[PDB]
Symmetry: none
Subunit: 45 residues, 4 copies
């Protein structure tokens, strides 16, 4: 029904809000992994 | 200790290998989170 | 395999460590050779 | 002894010639060792 659909979509919006809050931590993790890949290639990995 | 240094460096090589291997997956997560943020900011 | 690759890369890190330990002796040798080149040019070599 | 002095000075000229000629190669070794040290310190 429309109520269950709205409840599910609010849950989806909360999911999107939480993903957005994760973004700065995720971007720092990506930078650290880029550094690791550069070192990994440099030593001949 | 010789063996302890190898133990430490082996795990640091493994950690560096794992970070490097996870980079494409993490880049896809960052993109998906950016899409989620843009839609959340526009809607909410 | 991944084990042989890790073993080879540890060997590479030990190579880099040994090169780093050689650096002070190498810099003293470079200074002595710079002195020698200055004298060599001075006497018309 | 006249010949002994020439023997000594000839080899000192040769040693000085050899040091001077090795300078560019040794400078490249120093640079490579500095690169190895920077990466070893950052990783290990």
């Amino acid at each position: 029904s429309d109520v269950e659909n709205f409840e599910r979509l609010f849950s989806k919006l909360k999911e999107m809000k939480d993903k957005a809050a994760t973004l700065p931590h995720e971007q720092r993790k990506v930078h650290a992994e880029k550094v690791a890949k550069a070192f990994w290639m440099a030593i001949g990995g």
